[PDB]
């Protein structure tokens, strides 16, 4: 048989529900399981879906040059093949042989999906542009002036056509406001300004962090670009600490920090979380980099070419996309994913009302204190 060494990271190597009673390969399930099944079907052999001991992918010690992880199990004979989400790197390929990427991915941004924001004191002006509002105000006062200029400047055929045109105007304005407000309140389209990493770099309101231990951090350290260099400058000089120590920690931070935190992580994990509970996350923008997961095998081997051809055979057959849609979307829980109008939406109306009322009142008082004073003293 063959020693198929893997690692426990869903939805690749998952333990079946009834795994305590079962003792074998039927315990395991996921993407890599069916992948190895099809690989065997192509080549033809028996395999024992073992698991790595230290629970690590692969790396080396800077001093003892010891290769820990599945890399060690392959180089040091402990394993014969590693069907796992093993990232392809320059160092690993220098010691072992990778197959062609069966899953291309890259770093991506995860943010909580746009929730209903705070209404806004002056939200009732959104249905119409601003210049329109100013033009309305000034048309009103100008019409008032004109009506005033056909009573003292003249004693009507002027208050009639003016009345009709003002009727038309206010009619159309009321209608244009109501219609657009109804459109707003009926469908309620949601959109966030974060459509890429450029937007994150420009602004500084919402923060972002990365797993302090991983190739992601070193990527921002490395790869000096006008954008990512700025992001590293930010995350290096920024308080509090945006970095984390685990994935679920960053996800929970994104959740409870709904509108001021984003997480940069592998696109596969992000799409996986976006379909699980509580369905309160979403991946934005496009992959910042381009990496690929590929099968591994010791330097001197025999399954190298066979598996390298099997991967391309499956990629061309459409089977990898099938297994992906199975273990990411068909298994997906978030397959699916009116209200009254509170005062917070229209508070500005009452503010403006009371303001104009107090202003008119002050005007009346200072007019009376002059009128009566002149009638008395003179």
């Amino acid at each position: 048989t063959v020693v198929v060494t893997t690692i426990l990271e869903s939805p690749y190597v998952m333990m079946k529900k009834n795994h305590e009673m079962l003792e074998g390969n039927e315990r395991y399930e996921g993407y890599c399981v069916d992948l190895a099944a099809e690989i065997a079907k192509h080549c033809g052999f028996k395999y024992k879906l073992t698991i790595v001991g230290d629970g690590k992918y692969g790396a080396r010690d800077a001093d003892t040059k010891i290769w820990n992880g599945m890399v060690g199990e392959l180089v040091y004979g402990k394993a014969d093949i590693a069907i796992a989400p093993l990232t392809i790197t320059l160092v690993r390929e220098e010691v072992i042989d990778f197959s062609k990427p069966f899953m291309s991915l890259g770093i991506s941004i995860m943010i909580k999906k746009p929730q209903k924001s705070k209404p806004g004191v002056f939200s009732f002006l959104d249905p119409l542009a601003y210049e329109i509002w100013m033009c309305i105000v000034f048309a009103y006062i100008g019409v008032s002036v004109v009506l005033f200029l056909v009573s003292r400047f003249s004693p009507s055929l002027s208050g009639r056509i003016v009345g009709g045109v003002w009727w038309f105007f206010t009619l159309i304005i009321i209608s244009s406001y109501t219609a657009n407000l109804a459109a707003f309140l009926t469908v309620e389209r949601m959109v966030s300004p974060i459509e890429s990493a450029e937007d994150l770099s420009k602004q500084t309101e919402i923060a972002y962090g990365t797993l302090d231990s991983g190739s992601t951090k070193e990527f921002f350290r490395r790869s000096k670009i006008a954008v990512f260099d700025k992001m590293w400058t930010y995350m290096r000089s920024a308080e509090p600490s945006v970095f984390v120590r685990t994935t679920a920690e960053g996800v929970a931070r994104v959740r409870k920090s709904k509108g001021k935190y984003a997480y940069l992580l592998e696109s596969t994990m992000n799409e996986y979380i976006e379909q699980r509970k509580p369905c309160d996350t979403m991946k934005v923008g496009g992959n910042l980099d381009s990496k690929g997961y590929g099968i591994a095998t010791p330097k001197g081997s025999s399954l190298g070419n066979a598996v390298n051809l099997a991967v391309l055979k499956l990629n061309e057959q459409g089977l990898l996309d099938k297994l992906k849609n199975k273990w990411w979307y068909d298994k997906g829980e978030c397959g699916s994913g009116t209200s009254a109008l509170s005062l917070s939406n229209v508070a500005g109306v009452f503010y403006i009302l009371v303001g104009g009322l107090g202003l008119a009142m002050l005007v009346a008082l200072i007019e009376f204190c002059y009128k009566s004073r002149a009638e008395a003293k003179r």
Partner: protein, 134 residues
């Protein structure tokens, strides 16, 4: 941070504004009347005009005060209402309770009334403040 009380308080102090103004104007009117108390006809015309205005400036007091009380009721504000009720009781008493002697009593009444209304204006301002941010 609205809870129907910010609007009530601001709309009530907007009215307390002219309330204070009318109290001060009554103060000034009674001052000039007490100081004054062809020339005879002029004084007669002046006192007739001033008393006509006074008569015209009575109903708004009752109106806006009853409005304050009704609003504080409908807003479940049970501390301002209790501070305003005694004035309504005094008005109901004044209906069936009321040149030389009347003038001084009215002066004193207007002075205390101005004091109370200014106090209430400031209380309503502070209430709108610590009800608008909480």
């Amino acid at each position: 941070a609205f809870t129907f009380a910010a609007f009530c308080y601001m709309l009530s102090l907007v009215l307390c504004a002219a309330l204070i103004f009318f109290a001060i104007w009554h103060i000034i009117a009674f001052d000039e009347l007490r100081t004054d108390f062809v020339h005879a006809r002029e004084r007669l015309r002046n006192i007739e005009r001033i008393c006509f205005l006074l008569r015209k400036l009575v109903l708004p007091e009752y109106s806006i005060h009853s409005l304050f009380c009704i609003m504080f009721l409908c807003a479940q504000e049970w501390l301002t209402l209790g501070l305003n009720v005694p004035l309504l009781f005094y008005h109901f008493w004044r209906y069936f309770h009321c040149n030389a002697d009347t003038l001084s009593y009215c002066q004193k009444e207007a002075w205390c009334k101005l004091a109370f209304y200014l106090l209430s204006f400031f209380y309503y301002l502070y209430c709108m403040i610590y009800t608008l941010v909480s």
